[PDB]
Design a protein around this ligand. Structure first.
Ligand SMILES: [NH3+]c1ncnc2c1ncn2[C@@H]1O[C@@H]2CO[P@@](=O)(S)O[C@H]3[C@@H](F)[C@H](n4cnc5c([NH3+])ncnc54)O[C@@H]3COP(=O)(O)O[C@H]2[C@H]1F
Lengths: 171, 171
């Protein structure tokens, strides 16, 4: 049950901190049109690339949001930065969103390759589902999540841009 | 055993990334004298303040290291920043180090206060020791730790500056 602690740390040390300030940062970039929610990609195979634009030709990096800084555990001005992506459909700009992967899923992957971690590669999908399940239960009861965060969990046997656009059109 | 996953994520998603580049960043600040190792404070009571200078009058913030950036899980130029601190002894500058707290210990604390986390406040010291024990076993076998990281675990029943200075004088 390693994913339980990673999901609670993903909320306490990130979502609880950036989500209350996400609406003000998006409004600052819009004025001085990006959508209002932070869209988190949760691949249940834990295949998390670092270049999201290289994972889908229809997902294109656009710009960065205004940075969020704060003193965190003795580190002065710890930077919390997020990227804005454009989603294409038949060569048409179909949406603009703050998009990123669920980083602890990447840690879950590399943890399975370290023999000292005691985490078999077979349990990767099991813990990925537990991570999404735990995070869903936290955000459903979290006051910081006020229609400003959307979890996008999927299982690739496929268009990643189409999956993001379906959640984008629900708003 | 929540601390097991937090310690492995503290290494995979941080120490493995910044320690290979820490020597070059310290040499850049020195030329264009800070010590060579990253000193991590691990309070076993998990009492981690955000203002380290406010936790000890003999620990004084000095400057920031050159920032380390990198594309991480769809986030372009994720910033990894570290702070340089000065340690005083009888009003004398006794040492200069890159000092910070073990952030997952702070997450371990807040996790004990959330009722949905299923983590009792009594198990805080137990998991703090497991976190330090797990991290010690990782760094002892990690190739990225080449005499560039020093764990400072302590139990306050006391001078935090004196504890850091004792490890500082060992080098
Ligand atoms: N720059 C820097 N400074 C100091 N310390 C660091 C550090 N980077 C890593 N660490 C240490 O390694 C742990 C695991 O990091 P990891 O990356 S695998 O997972 C994170 C991540 F998914 C999400 N998250 C938090 N901040 C985030 C930002 N800015 N962007 C995107 N996602 C973020 O929340 C998880 C828990 O973050 P945490 O702070 O509680 O624990 C961290 C921290 F203790």
């Amino acid at each position: 049950n390693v994913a339980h602690g990673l999901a609670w740390s993903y909320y306490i040390g990130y979502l609880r901190l950036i989500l209350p300030e996400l609406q003000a940062r998006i409004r600052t970039y819009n004025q001085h049109a990006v959508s209002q929610r932070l869209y988190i990609l949760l691949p249940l195979d834990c295949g998390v690339p670092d270049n999201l634009s290289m994972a889908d030709p229809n997902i294109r990096f656009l710009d960065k949001l205004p940075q969020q800084t704060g003193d965190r555990a003795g580190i002065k001005d710890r930077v919390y930065s997020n990227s804005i992506y454009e989603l294409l459909e038949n060569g048409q700009r179909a949406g603009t969103c703050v998009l990123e992967y669920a980083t602890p899923l990447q840690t879950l992957f590399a943890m399975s390759q370290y023999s000292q971690a005691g985490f078999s590669r077979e349990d990767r999908l099991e813990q990925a589902k537990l991570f999404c399940r735990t995070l869903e239960d936290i955000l459903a009861d979290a006051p910081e999540s006020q229609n400003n965060c959307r979890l996008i969990a999927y299982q690739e046997p496929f268009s990643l841009s189409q999956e993001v656009l379906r959640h984008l059109r629900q708003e």
